[PDB]
């Protein structure tokens, strides 16, 4: 009916946060960075691959379906399978050699920074934030190419006797190669003569080779470890992600338990240098539920102050936290879904003792905040509106290059789908007595146990790129909250 | 009979070590630095002091003899006492205010760096050693004046967010004042009219005000503490001293036990950054025997690899270590004294599990070394000869300004007093079967449990300044031993 009021609030939110970000003195962004590479393969390309491999071996490899890529024949065998069988597929490789072979023999059309940390790192860099300290384990020369040249963006490197911060381009170790994901795309009509058989592809499809090298872990050098307090002293918060690449078993005697214990120490060391620091964790899909549970309960729960996740991820968390039914209700897409999203969010806040849980969905955001939070509900609302604007711009333009680009997102309309979805929640919360019609249309809802802030968002109908928007949403909000709080 | 052979060895030792010191990559020198100030007071000076104080108060202070200087009246009262009574005396002050009053109202004729660390710091600086990292708790602007401007000499300072090494002159905290000792000297015939009484001084005498401020302790900032491994990584050894200023009781709830525990952590942290590091402790007179015992047993014994002390100090250590008789025998000055010195040194090596115990006496040096030492007895002998030469030069010239000054000490004769003292030890050790006449006149004595190196030294008959020679002796030897060992 009236988004005009929401629209004014959006403008106030943008101006206030734009100015306030000057106050953030530094932010440590760590762990999962990688290169996503895309290649559309034609016939001339396939011919060069076959020129590099033995057909007898590939046919033998094809007979026994391979569940991993270790040799260039494994690649071709899987590639041919997914070429003839219509279905798409993702296959992992546990070596960096595969990427190198592909680079030397195939090429890629486009490449882009990937991973939650690397994206947030570049985002906050172009956003003008001071002291963006990124950390990528075993950073390589190629990886650093995909960081941006900003004076405010740094990375730790050891200069023969001292640990120092330099730009990513000047901080790599020549002895490592990078984690790169290859997405291979082919199209209807592709003809290939293999082993005398002729294969023509029925429909468009993509193949994904996902590098998951076992040596890249949630760990850091002793030099860096002992410098945590000095880093923490000089930043206002940290954004931590990538915990999904911890495995149950590591061949060198380590287990998931050891890297949970390491993760928590990293957080505690940071707090040793700055007791007022605020740690955010971006959550994501974690196939293995034993690990998901440890990440949430063992790591995230009492040591982290802020968590960011999408709708589905709330269900993943609830599911391993003892609420199978409520997870089932959020996953169903019907009217009740947003009622279950709300209550679930409220669960996560208490069960995991956090300052704030930020859930970003398609047409709206929902943030539940503890009563002992250092910033006000009004400020939090300013932060979601800002994050909503940043997401509009990034969807419009493909990427944020400056703090001014963000203003283009103010001109994306508040989504009607999202606004009407809140209407369902509005009725529920009013009837519950939790809420008054005035307080909800305000977007600020206060309750003895917690406050909860809901906004409708600006949704782009023909967006340029949908990669890293969710990561962007959580980062932009967390720093906005960091700007708002104060210190002497 | 033949020092000519010793003389050749001295020359070989100097050339070899002179060249080898290039190899020491850094050395951390920490804790006790201070300013020693000397003032000869005439009558015009005393008159200004009385012009600043009330006679009635000083006379009242004089009636009740004061055992500490807290007020400028306390100073004058003690000063007058020691002026009329012939005897010399040392009186402590527990504030830095006393120094300031004296500076503003009295002046001093000469001042010089003092303390074991500060002296060794400047010594190794002028000696050309790379990376001399000094550490003085609550370093002040005046204190830093007395460090020398050498590019190789540094000190830790925190620059608003980062811990860094700068020169002492640029690393002070404007908010601290320095530990300074005032030595006041007066002479026969001094006339002073106080309270109507006239005082004339009978004989020359000095008064010493020794600043012992309770806030200067054997501790360091958290920033520095967390940077120990990075420092240790970049030095080959550390020289630690000043443990004598730990008190039983500290008014803020701390006790000697806490600073022992801190001292040992400092050593362990350093070893975390460099496992091959070698720690030296220079020992000194420690009036309180409970503390002396803790320093030796609780701190020095298993965590330190090298100890340096004078003849008397060996007796102090033996005494609190359970050997009262052997301590009594070294203190007696008779022929047996050097037999007891030897055996005592051997005691200290085993009872305290060290790599080497270096005892420097007036005409000779005695170093007992464990069998698992990283450097050879021959090399050790080179180190004592070098240290003996450095001590000759410093006694000649008052101070070491360059690595070339050391060569002047080669031209100071081997002491006959010292050589003949060894003759007694030679007979004992031969008759003991420990030794063969050839092995002793060689100066290298090997034994199942330990090796022991004895040399005669170069002693100056009209020396310029005898302050810090012993500290110099131990430092020069320890670094010489550090130069000799090897690492990749
Ligand atoms: N066209 C769009 N305009 C604005 N926001 C969008 C658009 N498409 C997706 N989003 C936001 O991006 C989020 C997707 O992030 P998520 O599912 O967590 O994956 P990722 O974190 O990899 O981006 C959604 O929660 C949604 O709010
Ligand atoms: N004239 C001199 N020439 C050479 N060496 C000397 C001379 N006088 C003293 N020494 C050496 O200096 C040492 C004195 O040091 P010590 O008694 O430990 O006090 P400090 O450490 O304060 O100098 C003696 O062991 C002696 O070997
Ligand atoms: Mg996401
Ligand atoms: Mg001494
Ligand atoms: Ni092609
Ligand atoms: Ni450092
Ligand atoms: Ni657990
Ligand atoms: Ni005078
Ligand atoms: Ni540092
Ligand atoms: Ni003890």
Distance (Å, whole) CA A60 – CA A124: 49
What is the structure's resolution, reported in angstroms to one decimal? 2.9
Q: For residues B356 and B368, is the Cβ–Cβ distance under 8 A?
A: yes
Residue nearest to atom 13 of ligand 1 (CA): A470
Ligand 2 atom, smallest distance to B363 CA: 27
Rounded CA gap, A237 and A23, in Å? 12
SS3 B139: coil
Rounded distance between C-alpha atoms, residue A339 and residue A430, angstroms = 12
Assigned token pair, A48: 């060069």
- Find the closest chain B residue to A272 by CA distance: B222
CB A454 within 8 A of CB A365: yes
The DSSP line for A108-161 is: -SEEEEESHHHHHHHHHHHTT-S-EEEE-TT--HHHHHTS---TTEEEEEE-SS
A423 SS3 class: helix
CB B277 within 8 A of CB B270: yes
Q: Is the CB of B459 under 6 A from ligand 2?
A: yes
Nearest to B309 by CA among B279, B334, B281, B289: B281
Q: Concatenated DSSP letters for B225-278?
A: HHTHHHHHHT-SEEEE--GGG--SB-TTS-BHHHHHHHHHHHHHHHHHH-TT-E
Contact A187, A206 (CB under 8 A): no
Rounded CA-CA distance A42/A49 in Å is 11
The answer to whether the CB atoms of A223 and B234 lie below 8 A apart is no
Number of alpha carbons in the 13 Å side-chain half-sphere of residue A287: 4
**Helix, strand, or coil here: A370?**
strand
| Inter-chain touch B226–A227, beta carbons under 8 Å | yes
> Is A161 in contact with B226 (Cβ distance < 8 A)?
no
Q: Is residue B87 a contact partner of residue B65, using CB atoms and an 8 Å limit?
A: no
Q: What is the CATH number of domain B1-34+114-176+214-482?
A: 3.40.1190.20
| Ligand 1 atom 26: residue of nearest CA | A362
Ligand 1 binding pocket mutation candidate from A470, A471, A472 (most atoms within 8 A of CB): A470
Domain residue spans of chain B:
1-34+114-176+214-482, 35-113+177-212
Q: How was this structure determined?
A: X-ray
In 3D, which of B71, B43, B41 has the Cα closest to residue B58? B71
Q: Which of A25, A28, A226 to mutate to test the interface with B (most CBs of B within 10 A)?
A: A226
Ligand nearest to the CA of B187: 8
The continuous run of DSSP H or E covering B36 comes out as strand B34-40
User: What residues have CB less than 8 Å from A402, skipping those under 6 apart?
Assistant: A126, A128
Distance A72 CA to ligand 10 centre (A): 66
Q: For chain B, what is the total number of helices (H) and then of strands (E)?
A: 19, 18
Q: Which residue, A224, A236, A227, A215, is CA-closest to A97? A: A215
Helices (H) and strands (E) in chain A, counts: 19, 18
Candidate CATH numbers 3.40.50.300, 3.40.50.2300, 3.30.1110.20, 3.40.50.261; the one for domain A35-113+177-212: 3.30.1110.20
Provide the residue count of chain B: 488
């Amino acid at each position: 009916m009236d988004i005009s009021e929401w629209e004014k609030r959006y403008n106030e939110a943008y101006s206030d946060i734009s100015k306030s970000l000057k106050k953030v003195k530094g932010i440590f962004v760590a762990y999962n960075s990688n290169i996503d590479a895309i290649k559309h393969i034609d016939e001339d390309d396939i011919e060069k691959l076959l020129e590099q491999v033995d057909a007898k071996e590939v046919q033998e490899r094809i007979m026994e379906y391979p569940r991993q890529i270790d040799s260039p024949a494994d690649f071709v065998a899987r590639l041919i399978i997914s070429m003839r069988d219509g279905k798409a597929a993702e296959v992992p490789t546990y070596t960096t050699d595969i990427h190198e072979w592909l680079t030397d023999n195939l090429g890629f059309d486009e490449a882009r920074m990937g991973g939650q940390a690397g994206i947030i790192s570049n985002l906050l860099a172009n956003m003008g934030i001071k002291n963006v300290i990124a950390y990528v384990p075993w950073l390589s020369k190629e990886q650093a190419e995909y960081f941006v040249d900003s004076e405010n963006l740094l990375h730790p490197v050891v200069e023969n006797g001292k640990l120092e911060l330099k730009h990513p381009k000047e901080a790599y170790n020549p002895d490592n190669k990078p984690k790169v994901n290859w997405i291979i795309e082919f199209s209807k009509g592709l003809e290939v003569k293999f082993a005398g058989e002729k294969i023509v592809v029925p429909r468009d499809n993509r193949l994904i080779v996902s590098s998951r090298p076992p040596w890249i872990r949630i760990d850091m050098s002793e030099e860096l470890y002992e410098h945590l307090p000095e880093i923490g002293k000089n930043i206002d918060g940290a954004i931590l992600s990538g915990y999904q690449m911890i495995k149950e078993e590591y061949e060198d005697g380590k287990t998931y338990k050891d890297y949970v214990e390491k993760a928590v120490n990293v957080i505690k060391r940071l707090k040793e240098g700055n007791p007022d620091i605020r740690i955010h964790v971006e959550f994501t899909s974690i196939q293995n539920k034993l690990i998901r549970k440890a990440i949430l309960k063992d790591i995230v729960r009492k040591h982290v102050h802020s968590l960011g996740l999408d709708t589905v991820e709330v269900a993943n968390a609830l599911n391993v936290l003892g609420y199978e039914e409520l997870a089932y209700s959020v996953i169903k897409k019907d009217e009740n879904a947003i009622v279950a999203l709300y209550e679930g969010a409220v669960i996560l806040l208490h069960e995991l003792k956090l300052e704030r849980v930020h859930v970003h969905s398609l047409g709206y955001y929902i943030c539940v905040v503890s009563k002992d939070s250092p910033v006000s509900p009004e400020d939090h609302r300013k932060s979601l509106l800002f994050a909503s604007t940043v997401a509009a711009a990034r969807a419009l333009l493909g990427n944020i290059n400056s703090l001014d680009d963000i203003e283009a997102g103010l001109d994306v309309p508040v989504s009607e789908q999202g606004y009407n979805q809140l209407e369902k929640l509005e009725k529920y919360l009013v009837r519950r007595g939790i809420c008054t019609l005035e307080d909800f249309e305000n977007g600020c809802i206060c309750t003895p146990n917690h406050d909860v802030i809901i906004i409708p968002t600006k949704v782009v109908e023909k967006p340029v790129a949908t990669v890293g928007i969710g990561d962007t949403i959580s980062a932009a909000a967390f720093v906005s909250v960091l700007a708002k709080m104060k210190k002497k």
